[PDB]
């Protein structure tokens, strides 16, 4: 197995064109990889679209097309419809095994982009006497529903003790998510600050809390 890489998220207007790529950590993607493309609607079973680079199934619409572009397997969509919104995965064969990609969240913009509002809560005084410490980073009112959350203690990135949900659809067709950072009471006091970084559509919001 290799490391298959796709775009985290891409956007396209209703009726526009967009191309999703699928890279491999071993080098260029030839036809011997036999790349497949699947689409998964939220809550549905993934649906087969393209098999072996550029072959459509009996149910794949003519809007979808595949090829190899600059050492990467590419899936091109022409004439975007809101029905085509979903998560696209690419499956390749390498060293006698099938490897799935991270997937790309494609959104067909039915409305303009919405910026998220982020609120960061420090650990309460009750939890510290329970010998625990949890940072709550709340995100809401962002569209499309694709976001990346990162944590940093002081000036160093933090990945141990982080757990984040996936975006869920609100009532006003927007999305919300939350991230948690579980720490020990000694770690909460041995650092000057902790921050929650929220990146959405190239714009980043960072909130910071401090024990002092």
């Amino acid at each position: 197995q290799t490391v298959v890489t796709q775009e985290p998220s891409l956007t396209v207007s209703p009726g526009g064109t967009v191309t999703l790529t699928c890279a491999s950590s071993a080098g260029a993607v030839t036809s011997d990889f036999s790349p497949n493309w699947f689409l998964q609607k939220p809550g549905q079973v993934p649906r087969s679209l393209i098999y072996n680079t550029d072959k459509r199934h009996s149910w794949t619409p003519a809007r979808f097309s595949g090829s190899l572009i600059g050492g990467k397997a590419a899936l091109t969509l022409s004439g975007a419809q809101p029905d085509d919104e979903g998560d696209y995965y690419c499956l390749v064969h390498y060293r006698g095994a099938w490897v799935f990609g991270g997937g790309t969240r494609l959104t067909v913009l039915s409305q303009p982009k919405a910026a998220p509002s982020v609120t960061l809560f420090p650990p309460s005084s009750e939890e510290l006497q329970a010998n625990k410490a949890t940072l709550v980073c709340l995100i809401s009112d962002f569209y499309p529903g694709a976001v990346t959350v990162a944590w940093k203690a002081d000036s160093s990135p933090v990945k141990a003790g982080v757990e984040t949900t996936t975006p869920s659809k609100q009532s006003n067709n927007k999305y919300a998510a939350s991230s948690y950072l579980s720490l020990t009471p000694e770690q909460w006091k041995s650092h000057r600050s902790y921050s929650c970084q929220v990146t959405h559509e190239g714009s980043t919001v960072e909130k910071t809390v401090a024990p002092t």
Partner: protein
């Protein structure tokens, strides 16, 4: 129109063995098809598990070869999947699929055709923790408005309802969906937007109900 139907245990205890079956309709096992297994962890992407041909030849995920066992059953027209030493990291929705086998000149294992039929998926949850009541902690405090809430920490299983002031405060309340921690416990946060000038004279109480543990909590959120 080949149809697939998988069946699983649904709920599994840790360090156990997972046994899944997939019934095939409209097609036979002895045909030229590879019977695959695919799982998807909660909030993550697809992960290829393995595939098996009717002659017995298998191909497994390199990072899970020692724990994966696949077999076929021709008299029942089914194929199975066996995963051992299962932990909470194996909780996922499991699918069975198939793909056509291709060849060049003589009979051979050339991979030209791809996956064309999917199952309906089966939910497999590895209960790494038992029933636990929630721990409610206050989230104490946007100019004219302020945000306060309650942190419902480490509970199991899923059903939890949250209200504010016995259901009287309904405008400005936002309850986030819970996160599934790696320890097998859930945790959510419910926040309410209130006028910042009333924080000194108005009291706000977050009501938590967890019927699986028969626990009800009313938590006053102070300005702190």
């Amino acid at each position: 129109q080949v149809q697939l139907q998988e069946s699983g245990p649904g709920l599994m205890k840790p360090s156990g063995t997972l046994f899944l079956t997939c019934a095939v309709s409209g097609a036979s096992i002895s045909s030229s098809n590879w019977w695959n297994w695919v799982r998807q962890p909660p909030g993550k992407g697809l992960e290829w598990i393995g595939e098996i041909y009717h002659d017995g030849s298998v191909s497994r995920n390199p990072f899970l070869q020692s724990r994966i066992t696949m077999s076929v059953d021709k008299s029942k027209n089914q194929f199975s999947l066996k995963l051992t030493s299962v932990t909470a990291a194996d909780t996922a929705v499991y699918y069975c699929a198939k793909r056509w086998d291709s060849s060049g000149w003589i009979t051979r294992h050339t991979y030209d055709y791809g996956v064309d039929v999917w199952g309906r998926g089966t939910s497999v949850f590895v209960a790494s923790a038992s029933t636990k009541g929630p721990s409610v902690f206050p989230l104490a405090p946007s100019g004219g408005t302020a945000a306060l809430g309650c942190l419902v920490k480490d509970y199991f299983p899923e059903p939890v309802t949250v209200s504010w002031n016995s259901g009287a405060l309904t405008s400005g309340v936002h309850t986030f969906p819970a996160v599934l921690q790696s320890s097998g416990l859930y945790s959510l946060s419910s926040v309410v937007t209130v006028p910042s000038s009333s924080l000194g004279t108005q009291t706000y109480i977050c009501n938590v109900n967890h019927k699986p543990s028969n626990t009800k909590v009313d938590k006053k959120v102070e300005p702190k």
